[PDB]
């Protein structure tokens, strides 16, 4: 087992304990609708991550009865691409969205393929823009395919920052979760979707959208206002990467999986998760272990099977680690907090994980760029590439 593999297991253990990557939906009885919260992580060019914290409210347009759900989440897989024959400033989007997080007439409008139209008018720090999108949704699979054009010329913000704003009625709700689909229940009259999106260390978007059928088209009409942005920051300075899977990356995912799946049955149970977390000096309760599993447990059986684990690792490719998360993983090895992983510290962790003085020294010696016999933060980072 390499230093890289053990560090990777340590990061995934902390991710399973703490990372919240889903779209969390709650009933809002006062508004006869829902609230949601989630965050997005945008990759900054030449390294680092820009966090976008989303707060959402949805309220029905009509007086008809709607479904108010139990707490649950949407799990989003999105791919951004370019149309090689498109000269206009554009974004091609493919998304698969599935509801989970509940353990084991409007819906009728979504059993086939539904044309979509999106229209956005934006104003960020007084830079105005418009976007038009079209494509189709196939809620049977939770599938969206859209192409968007900036109709005003050059988009003054990165396309990725508009993805969440630019139709959750296309989400796939599993059969055991159909009563919890507010979005389809509000159709065809539709819903108002409002957000505030906080770009950490930068300004915020405020959005208001009407999502409803106009004939047999699902239309999303949006207004967006951004205030308090930095003209040279990551958004108005265009410093976010547009978009982002090797056999090697998959094999690394599997090596991590097999450290949790100690009985080799192809699933990770609360007991198995607990065993690893206790070995890294955490002490989660049964209820907390069940909540960790729930974040990843697509089928709601109460375990993480192998494909569930690989889906989570694939989705985590859009959630680049923050300094604070990497410092936390470093800290599991750097138990005395002095900024240096000693051979003693690496042996303590390796031992606790059930993996010779020469083998430990050898591991240090590989990561130890500066030759001091210890691993500092910068060397830890470099070792994980
Ligand atoms: Ca197992
Ligand atoms: Ca499962
Ligand atoms: Ca230390
Ligand atoms: Ca060193």
Residues contacting 68, CB < 8 A, separation 6+: 27, 28, 29, 32, 33, 34, 182
Number of the ligand closest to the Cα of 271: 1
Number of the ligand closest to the Cα of 339: 3
Residues with CB under 5 A from ligand 2 (ion): 297, 299, 301, 303, 305
Q: CA–CA separation, 306 vs 319, rounded Å?
A: 20
Confirm if 176 and 300 have CB atoms less than 8 A apart. yes
Cα(302) to centroid(ligand 1), Å: 12
Secondary structure E strands in the chain: 23-28, 33-43, 49-60, 72-81, 90-100, 113-124, 127-138, 143-150, 191-199, 204-214, 217-227, 267-268, 304-305, 340-341, 375-376
As a residue count, the chain comes to 385
Buried b (16+ CB within 10 A) or exposed e, 210-222: bbbbeeeebbbbb
Tokens of 341: 């992983």
CB atoms within 10 A of CB 83: 12
Cα(308) to centroid(ligand 2), Å: 7
Inter-CA distances, 136 with 1, 115, 151, 162, Å: 47, 4, 20, 18
Confirm if 270 and 286 have CB atoms less than 8 A apart. yes
Tokens of 117: 């139209």
DSSP states of 298-313 as a string? SS-SSSEEHHHHHHHH
Number of the ligand closest to the Cα of 267: 1
Place of tokens 């508004």: 31
Residue 182's closest CA among 38, 39, 35, 21? 35
- Report the SS3 class of residue 214: strand
Cα(68) to centroid(ligand 2), Å: 25
Instruction: Classify burial at 350, counting beta carbons within 10 Å of its beta carbon; exposed 0-12, middle 13-18, buried 19 or more.
Output: middle
Cα(275) to centroid(ligand 1), Å: 11
Strands 72-81 and 143-150 turn out to be unpaired
**Final resolution, Å:** 2.0
Residue 262's closest CA among 247, 248, 278? 278
Cα(322) to centroid(ligand 1), Å: 30
CB atoms within 10 A of CB 379: 21
Helix and strand counts by DSSP (H, E) for the chain: 10, 15
């Amino acid at each position: 087992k390499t230093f890289k593999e053990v560090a990777n297991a340590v990061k995934i253990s902390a991710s399973l304990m703490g990372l919240k990557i889903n779209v969390y939906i709650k009933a809002d009885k006062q508004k006869n609708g829902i609230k949601a919260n989630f965050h997005i992580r945008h990759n900054i060019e030449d390294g680092g991550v820009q966090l976008a914290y989303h707060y959402q409210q949805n309220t029905p347009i009509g007086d008809g009865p709607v479904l108010l759900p139990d707490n649950h989440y949407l799990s989003v897989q999105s791919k951004l691409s370019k149309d090689p024959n498109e000269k206009r400033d554009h974004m091609v989007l493919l998304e698969f969205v599935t509801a989970a997080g509940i353990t084991l007439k409007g819906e009728e409008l979504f059993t086939g393929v539904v044309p979509i139209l999106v229209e956005l008018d934006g104003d960020v720090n007084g830079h105005k823009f418009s976007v038009s999108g079209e494509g189709e949704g196939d809620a049977t699979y939770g599938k969206l395919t859209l192409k968007f054009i900036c109709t005003t010329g050059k988009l003054p913000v990165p396309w990725p920052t508009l993805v969440t704003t630019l139709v959750q009625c296309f989400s796939r709700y599993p059969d055991h979760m159909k009563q919890h689909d507010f979005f389809k229940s509000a159709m065809p009259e539709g819903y108002i979707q409002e957000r505030t999106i906080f770009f950490k260390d930068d300004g915020n978007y405020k959005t208001r959208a009407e999502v409803k059928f106009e004939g047999d088209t699902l239309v999303n009409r949006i207004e967006l206002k951004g205030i308090d942005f930095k003209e040279d920051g990551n958004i108005l300075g265009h410093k976010l990467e547009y978009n982002l899977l090797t056999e090697e990356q998959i094999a690394e995912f599997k090596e991590a999986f097999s450290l949790f799946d100690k009985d080799g049955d192809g699933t990770i149970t609360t007991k198995e998760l607990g065993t690893v977390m206790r070995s890294l000096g955490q002490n989660p309760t049964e209820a907390e272990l069940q909540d960790m599993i729930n974040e990843v447990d697509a089928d709601g059986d109460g375990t993480i099977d192998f494909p569930e684990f690989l889906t989570m690792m694939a989705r985590k490719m859009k959630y680049r680690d923050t300094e604070e998360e990497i410092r936390e993983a470093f800290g599991v090895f750097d138990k005395d907090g002095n900024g240096y992983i000693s051979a003693a510290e690496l042996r303590h962790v390796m031992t606790n994980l059930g993996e010779t003085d020469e083998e430990v020294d050898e591991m240090i010696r590989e990561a130890d760029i500066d030759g001091d016999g210890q691993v500092n933060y910068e060397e830890f980072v470099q070792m994980m590439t």
